[PDB]
């Protein structure tokens, strides 16, 4: 069984970061060389692993998380980061073992006049735990008066749109991100490089 990485990296559509997609990879043979020999990535940064050694390693599970953010937010997809994305949308743990891979997707995800489909969460009562996902769309209570789910004074819709346009500067352009988590439990390791 070959691990289905192509389904993740080459997906036609990507998730909004607040509703990031997760694909569990298990019990398969992974050829990571299609990733580490590729010249298509703007970021390929690993934690706890050397990417060129990946075809020699075995893990219990691999998770592939994917979403779109803007280019100047990719730096928040790292252990120890703060900010709207790290705090309210997608959080990595301090002891992360995995790789963060991103590429400029201006040609796919931007639209003349704006692509409003990609959203992020701007308000939240507390920070996400690592790998927590919040897809709720409850009106956020910024004041002492309950909102009752009605937007208005001190009561905010918690998501905003990126509105990507192709003429935006590169830090504001959309980037597709895939986070690979390499999980070794005290258990059999069934995601392996080729033998």
């Amino acid at each position, epitope marked *: 069984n070959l691990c289905p990485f192509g389904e993740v990296f080459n997906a036609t559509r990507f998730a909004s970061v607040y509703a990031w997609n997760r694909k569990r990879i298990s019990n398969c043979v992974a050829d990571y060389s299609v990733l580490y020999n590729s010249a298509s990535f703007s970021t390929f940064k690993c934690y706890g692993v050397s990417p060129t050694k990946l075809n020699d390693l075995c893990f219990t599970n691999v998770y592939a998380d994917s979403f779109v953010i803007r280019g100047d937010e990719v730096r928040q997809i790292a252990p120890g980061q703060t900010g709207k994305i790290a705090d309210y949308n997608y959080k990595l743990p301090d002891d992360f073992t995995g790789c963060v891979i991103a590429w400029n997707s201006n040609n796919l995800d931007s639209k003349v006049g704006g692509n*409003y489909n990609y959203l992020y969460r701007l308000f939240r009562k507390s920070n996400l735990k690592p790998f927590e996902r919040d897809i709720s769309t409850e*009106i956020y209570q910024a004041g002492s008066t309950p909102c009752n*789910g*009605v*937007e208005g*004074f001190n009561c905010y*819709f918690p*998501l905003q749109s990126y*509105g990507f346009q192709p003429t935006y500067g590169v830090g504001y352009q959309p980037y597709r991100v895939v986070v690979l988590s390499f999980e070794l439990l005290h258990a059999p390791a069934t995601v392996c490089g080729p033998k």
Partner: nanobody, 120 residues
Framework: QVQLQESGGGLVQAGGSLRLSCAASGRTSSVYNMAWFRQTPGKEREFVAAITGNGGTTLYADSVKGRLTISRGNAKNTVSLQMNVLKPDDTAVYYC?????????????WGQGTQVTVSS
């Protein structure tokens, strides 16, 4: 899936009054702030007006104050925009937006827009 649908556009004569409408569809337990933006070909889309969930607070672009009125419609997440004394340069695609406040184009939900063409 929350979607917005505008109606009421078309070809109108200068001086005339026109009402546009927007309705949200999809399962939701929220009542949104709703807004109207407009876009002329070759130009950036621009804020026109917004109204809060309960209809009690409105926000207008300075250029349209006194000529345009925004109001909530009959269902929870519906909004109306009446434009009076239409001018040729009111010609635009008019978009409904929902979820947010203010004049920037970062509201959560957006319609595909309705064309208004003013003749003289």
């Amino acid at each position: 899936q929350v979607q917005l649908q505008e109606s009421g556009g078309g070809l109108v004569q200068a001086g005339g009054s026109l009402r546009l409408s927007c309705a949200a569809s999809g399962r939701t337990s929220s009542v949104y702030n709703m807004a109207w933006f407009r876009q002329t070909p070759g130009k950036e889309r621009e804020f026109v007006a917004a109204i809060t969930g309960n209809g009690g607070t409105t926000l207008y672009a300075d250029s349209v104050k006194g000529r345009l009125t925004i109001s909530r419609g009959n269902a929870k997440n519906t909004v109306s925009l009446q434009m009076n004394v239409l001018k040729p340069d009111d010609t635009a695609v008019y978009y409904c937006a929902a979820g947010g406040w203010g004049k920037e184009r970062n509201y959560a939900y957006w319609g595909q827009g309705t064309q208004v063409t003013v003749s003289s």
